Design a binder for this molecule. Structure first.
Ligand code: 1O4
Length: 140
């Protein structure tokens, strides 16, 4: 099963999520991203189980990526669901920051505020190899 789960906002982080997948696979990691590895069945259960299966949770924070999480107290938003699963399973969470502005904790539902306490990696378009090398250091 995959070592790394990539969580991303489809309308803004899909290209970076795909780029991360390629690089991490070239360095020998088994990676889950939905468009490559989510197969048949009820997607809610399969996606949550895939987060649970992976030791590492790579979170692509593109601009506004947590906006649809705000006030989503019923946890219907999928990035919210994936984050809460990763937090509650104690995953190695690795945020990747690409134009993202850190929100104040109290705008987010309580069950995901802890995502802001993890050390994040700044994506550098000018120094991508170095960014990737730092991500690999963060992976377990
Ligand atoms: N693979 C997945 C399948 C289904 C739903 C998913 C929702 C979320 N995700 C996870 O959550 C993050 C994205 O959140 P998001 O809020 O960016 O996503 P969207 O709500 O835009 O949906 C994403 C796309 O699935 C289309 N869609 C809607 N109903 C569908 C259906 N019955 N069968 C197929 N496709 C459907 C929807 O039309 C769009 O093309 C990622 O990390 C990812 O792992 C992955 C999904």
């Amino acid at each position: 099963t995959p070592d790394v789960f990539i969580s991303y906002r489809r309308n803004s982080g899909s290209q970076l999520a795909s780029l991360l997948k390629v690089h991490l696979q070239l360095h020998g990691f088994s990676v889950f991203i939905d468009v490559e590895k989510l197969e048949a069945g009820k997607f809610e259960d399969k996606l949550i189980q895939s987060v649970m299966g992976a030791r590492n949770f790579v979170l692509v924070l593109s601009p506004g990526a947590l906006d649809k999480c705000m006030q989503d107290h019923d946890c219907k938003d999928w990035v919210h669901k994936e984050i809460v699963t990763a937090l509650s399973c104690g995953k190695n969470i690795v945020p990747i920051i690409d134009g993202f502005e850190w929100p104040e904790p109290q705008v987010l539902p309580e069950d995901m505020q802890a995502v802001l306490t993890f050390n994040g990696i700044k994506w550098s378009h000018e120094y991508q190899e170095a960014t990737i090398e730092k991500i690999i250091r963060f992976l377990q």
